[PDB]
Amino acid sequence: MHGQVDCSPGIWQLDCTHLEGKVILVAVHVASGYIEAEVIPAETGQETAYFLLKLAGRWPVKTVHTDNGSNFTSTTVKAACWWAGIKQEFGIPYNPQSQGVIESMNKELKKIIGQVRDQAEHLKTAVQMAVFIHNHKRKGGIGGYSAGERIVDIIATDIQ
Amino acid sequence: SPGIWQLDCTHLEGKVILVAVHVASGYIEAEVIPAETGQETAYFLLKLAGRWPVKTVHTDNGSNFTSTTVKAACWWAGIKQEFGIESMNKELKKIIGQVRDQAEHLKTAVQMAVFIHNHKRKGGIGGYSAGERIVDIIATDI
Amino acid sequence: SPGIWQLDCTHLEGKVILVAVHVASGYIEAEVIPAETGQETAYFLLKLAGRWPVKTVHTDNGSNFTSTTVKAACWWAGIKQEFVIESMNKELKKIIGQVRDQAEHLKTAVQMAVFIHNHKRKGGIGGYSAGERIVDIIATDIQ
Amino acid sequence: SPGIWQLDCTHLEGKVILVAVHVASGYIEAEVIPAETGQETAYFLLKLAGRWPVKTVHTDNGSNFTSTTVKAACWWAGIKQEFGIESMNKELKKIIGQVRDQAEHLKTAVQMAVFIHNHKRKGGIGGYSAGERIVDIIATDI
Amino acid sequence: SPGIWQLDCTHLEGKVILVAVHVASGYIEAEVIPAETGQETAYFLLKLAGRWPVKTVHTDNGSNFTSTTVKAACWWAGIKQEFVIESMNKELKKIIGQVRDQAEHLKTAVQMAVFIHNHKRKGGIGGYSAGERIVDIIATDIQ
Amino acid sequence: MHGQVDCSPGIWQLDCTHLEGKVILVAVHVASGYIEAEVIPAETGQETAYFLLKLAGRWPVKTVHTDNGSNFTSTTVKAACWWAGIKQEFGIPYNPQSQGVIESMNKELKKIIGQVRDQAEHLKTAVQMAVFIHNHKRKGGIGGYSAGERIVDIIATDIQ
Ligand SMILES: [Mg+2]
Ligand SMILES: [Mg+2]
Ligand SMILES: [Mg+2]
Ligand SMILES: [Mg+2]
Ligand SMILES: [Mg+2]
Ligand SMILES: [Mg+2]
Numbered sequence: 001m002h003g004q005v006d007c008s009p010g011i012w013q014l015d016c017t018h019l020e021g022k023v024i025l026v027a028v029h030v031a032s033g034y035i036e037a038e039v040i041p042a043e044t045g046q047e048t049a050y051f052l053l054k055l056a057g058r059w060p061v062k063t064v065h066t067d068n069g070s071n072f073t074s075t076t077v078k079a080a081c082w083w084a085g086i087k088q089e090f091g092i093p094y095n096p097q098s099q100g101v102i103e104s105m106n107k108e109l110k111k112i113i114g115q116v117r118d119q120a121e122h123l124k125t126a127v128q129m130a131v132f133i134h135n136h137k138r139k140g141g142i143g144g145y146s147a148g149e150r151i152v153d154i155i156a157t158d159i160q
Numbered sequence: 161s162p163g164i165w166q167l168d169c170t171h172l173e174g175k176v177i178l179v180a181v182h183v184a185s186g187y188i189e190a191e192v193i194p195a196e197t198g199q200e201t202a203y204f205l206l207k208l209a210g211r212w213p214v215k216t217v218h219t220d221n222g223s224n225f226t227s228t229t230v231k232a233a234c235w236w237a238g239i240k241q242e243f244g245i246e247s248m249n250k251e252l253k254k255i256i257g258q259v260r261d262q263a264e265h266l267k268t269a270v271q272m273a274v275f276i277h278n279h280k281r282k283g284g285i286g287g288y289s290a291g292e293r294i295v296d297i298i299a300t301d302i
Numbered sequence: 303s304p305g306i307w308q309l310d311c312t313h314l315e316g317k318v319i320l321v322a323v324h325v326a327s328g329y330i331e332a333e334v335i336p337a338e339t340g341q342e343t344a345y346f347l348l349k350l351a352g353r354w355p356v357k358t359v360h361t362d363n364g365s366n367f368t369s370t371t372v373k374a375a376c377w378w379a380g381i382k383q384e385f386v387i388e389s390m391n392k393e394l395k396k397i398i399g400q401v402r403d404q405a406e407h408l409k410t411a412v413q414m415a416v417f418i419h420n421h422k423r424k425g426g427i428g429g430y431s432a433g434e435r436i437v438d439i440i441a442t443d444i445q
Numbered sequence: 446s447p448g449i450w451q452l453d454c455t456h457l458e459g460k461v462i463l464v465a466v467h468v469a470s471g472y473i474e475a476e477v478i479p480a481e482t483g484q485e486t487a488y489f490l491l492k493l494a495g496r497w498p499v500k501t502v503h504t505d506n507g508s509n510f511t512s513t514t515v516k517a518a519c520w521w522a523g524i525k526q527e528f529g530i531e532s533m534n535k536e537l538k539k540i541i542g543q544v545r546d547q548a549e550h551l552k553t554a555v556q557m558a559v560f561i562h563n564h565k566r567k568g569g570i571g572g573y574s575a576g577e578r579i580v581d582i583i584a585t586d587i
Numbered sequence: 588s589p590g591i592w593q594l595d596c597t598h599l600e601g602k603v604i605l606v607a608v609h610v611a612s613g614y615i616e617a618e619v620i621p622a623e624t625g626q627e628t629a630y631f632l633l634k635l636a637g638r639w640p641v642k643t644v645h646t647d648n649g650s651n652f653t654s655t656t657v658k659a660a661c662w663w664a665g666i667k668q669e670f671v672i673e674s675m676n677k678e679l680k681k682i683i684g685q686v687r688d689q690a691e692h693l694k695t696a697v698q699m700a701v702f703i704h705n706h707k708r709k710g711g712i713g714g715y716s717a718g719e720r721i722v723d724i725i726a727t728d729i730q
Numbered sequence: 731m732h733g734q735v736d737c738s739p740g741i742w743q744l745d746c747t748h749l750e751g752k753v754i755l756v757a758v759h760v761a762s763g764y765i766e767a768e769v770i771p772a773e774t775g776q777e778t779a780y781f782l783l784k785l786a787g788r789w790p791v792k793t794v795h796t797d798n799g800s801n802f803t804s805t806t807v808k809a810a811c812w813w814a815g816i817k818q819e820f821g822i823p824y825n826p827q828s829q830g831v832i833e834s835m836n837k838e839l840k841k842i843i844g845q846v847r848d849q850a851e852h853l854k855t856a857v858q859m860a861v862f863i864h865n866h867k868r869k870g871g872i873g874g875y876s877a878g879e880r881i882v883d884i885i886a887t888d889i890q
Pocket of ligand 5: 595596597647
């Protein structure tokens with residue numbers, strides 16, 4: 001939700017979740033809690049490669065963790081990470097409470113999607129709506145900082 | 161490396177056998193599990209880790225091996241998982257066929273076969289059984 | 303002798319725990335079994351015998367321990383039967399309490415406690431773990 | 446008495462946490478130690494003693510607590526050991542479960558939990574946190 | 588203000604010592620860290636923040652001090668960052684030399700020196716120790 | 731070896747040491763350096779109680795220090811000390827050089843046992859032999875006084 005205090009700014013986790021028979025690829029910036037999500041045509045390495053290339057063109061992605069889905073281990077994804085200078089790590093780090101960061105984000109996202117599903121004709125719309133709600137939510141964690149603000153602040157300081 | 165093992169599941173008689181192999185010595189541990197599930201695998205691995213100094217485990221992408229329960233066990237035990245023995249499964253099945261008739265249940269035959277594989281004199285001279293080798297390797301390492 | 307082991311059953315939460323202690327080293331193996339029977343005891347014994355060179359097993363006159371099914375396992379495995387581990391049971395139960403909350407089923411808590419006991423370095427001027435002593439003892443015996 | 450503390454070791458995630466409790470205020474200091482050994486405990490106690498006026502330490506007969514290294518530290522520090530909190534370990538573990546997901550490593554989560562336990566407002570009004578209490582007790586005592 | 592602390596790294600025997608001084612009182616905390624990194628600095632800072640009410644930390648622009656990992660700790664702990672302790676480092680190193688031979692590792696000698704500095708009564712007409720002033724200052728602030 | 735110049739005559743320390751898999755209970759009169767040792771069947775509070783009762787029947791034992799072994803903290807030992815008028819203290823006083831009096835005696839005794847082990851069929855014999863050698867050894871400390879002579883001299887003066 002609000003990220004992990006002991007993580008580096010270049011660490012991300014990715015995974016796919018499922019809703020209404022659709023595939024939702026989710027990425028989470030571990031240090032901040034910021035996510036990017038999107039319904040993809042098929043749970044393939046091709047679709048996955050595209051999403052990683054987009055993410056890398058906007059953020060300074062150093063390391064990505066994913067489980068061992070064939071889509072995540074495909075040569076298309078491997079090729080994509082290599083081109084983008086991304087170190088791929090297989091297996092989502094374990095956490096006794098959340099089970100895994102991306103894991104808790106998949107659940108949070110589905111929960112949010114359930115609250116606003118009534119205000120969207122298409123699931124794809126509800127997905128972006130939920131991501132918006134998640135990223136803009138501010139909580140006492142940091143003087144009223146949202147995950148969307150934390151990530152740009154974290155990356156900006158790194159740059160500076 | 162003395163702390164490296166490879167796990168995998170194999171099938172016989174419509175049943176599932178979880179197999180563990182100490183890469184350095186060829187030592188084996190196997191068991192018929194009621195279902196090819198993460199909780200059965202996590203349990204097996206936990207027993208194995210409390211007996212041998214397990215540091216790294218290599219497996220295929222099998223759902224049971226990529227499961228959270230197994231991930232959780234390795235986390236508590238200090239084991240690093242790796243994905244990516246096929247002959248051990250073969251040898252094991254061969255030995256099982258050899259002693260199958262000495263037991264009604266495959267679970268018993270599997271244990272008899274592990275016993276045989278780990279204690280069987282190799283090279284025509286004692287001291288080179290998979291079971292003697294692992295003990296020497298681990299000891300020469302501690 | 304390094305081939306000697308003591309076996310006995312202990313109980314917790316109304317469950318039976320079969321415990322095996324390598325007398326010479328203190329190393330142990332334990333497991334919750336569905337029943338205090340020769341069938342369960344024999345199966346446990348056969349697994350144990352397949353990993354360590356067991357030559358002699360000392361147990362009480364427990365009904366499951368004096369079973370022909372356990373006797374057959376010993377015959378097959380070449381184990382001598384004779385009718386520390388007591389202390390070991392208290393020792394084990396103590397570690398289980400420390401990790402009990404940490405596991406859902408006593409089953410896995412027992413394995414956690416075994417792992418802890420075998421890999422914990424103490425005693426004898428504090429230096430080795432029971433898991434190191436058993437391998438050293440036996441390997442030396444082999445050497 | 447403001448100079449009395451109780452130490453003890455507790456376990457979580459296959460790791461060891463050394464816990465120190467100021468009996469008078471309930472203030473806590475904990476840390477994941479690499480091994481339940483006397484040198485790790487003596488070091489922890491030494492840091493604690495150079496910060497708080499530690500006069501007496503109560504512990505169980507744990508080998509690390511009955512160790513010479515620890516005995517030597519208490520000797521140099523002027524601390525009197527006593528043998529013979531269980532709830533503090535419980536509370537600590539509870540708070541750790543509450544913030545566990547905010548860190549990858551338990552060592553970080555433990556410190557977050559100590560922070561939380563020592564600074565958490567109690568009674569619905571400020572000034573009664575374990576951390577505020579110890580400081581007042583020690584000060585009212587010096 | 589009683590919530591202000593100065594932090595900085597000093598070196599001895601090729602080892603890094605992270606030092607924290609409570610500006611208001613002179614009280615200090617120091618520790619040999621494996622590395623001059625934000626990860627080590629953040630962890631040290633989180634422990635410090637859990638025992639004293641830290642509000643502001645003044646450090647130089649040291650790479651480990653300007654790290655996002657240390658920034659995150661401060662965010663989490665509610666600490667303001669701003670980029671005496673210098674003198675404190677000389678002071679500390681001096682006490683370390685007096686007890687160095689007394690300890691095997693610099694690690695424990697640093698803690699011995701900290702203990703000595705905080706509990707030694709001097710200055711201001713000679714009367715209180717830095718360990719007494721910090722508790723009095725803060726508690727008063729609370730009162 | 732030759733005791734501590736600042737100790738009282740009623741102070742003793744006890745501990746168990748180990749040799750050839752046997753348990754050796756050792757007692758040392760701190761003021762003199764005099765020891766009594768003996769192989770015991772098991773490191774129990776029962777065996778320990780017996781040894782304390784023997785010691786107390788011969789010497790004016792006022793205070794005994796021992797570490798926290800279960801044998802030393804057992805109610806049998808507590809009961810024994812109470813009956814004998816012995817104050818039990820837990821934890822062997824620390825000494826920067828010897829680590830602890832009984833500690834250095836355990837090492838001295840093992841060293842002596844090692845020198846004469848060849849002249850004894852049984853370890854139990856070697857143990858009494860080593861105690862004899864230790865207690866009768868005289869050194870410049872006091873005009874040629876051995877620890878065996880120092881203790882009787884110390885206790886005698888106290889009585890007188
Ligand atoms: Mg997935
Ligand atoms: Mg497979
Ligand atoms: Mg029984
Ligand atoms: Mg304890
Ligand atoms: Mg600096
Ligand atoms: Mg002792």
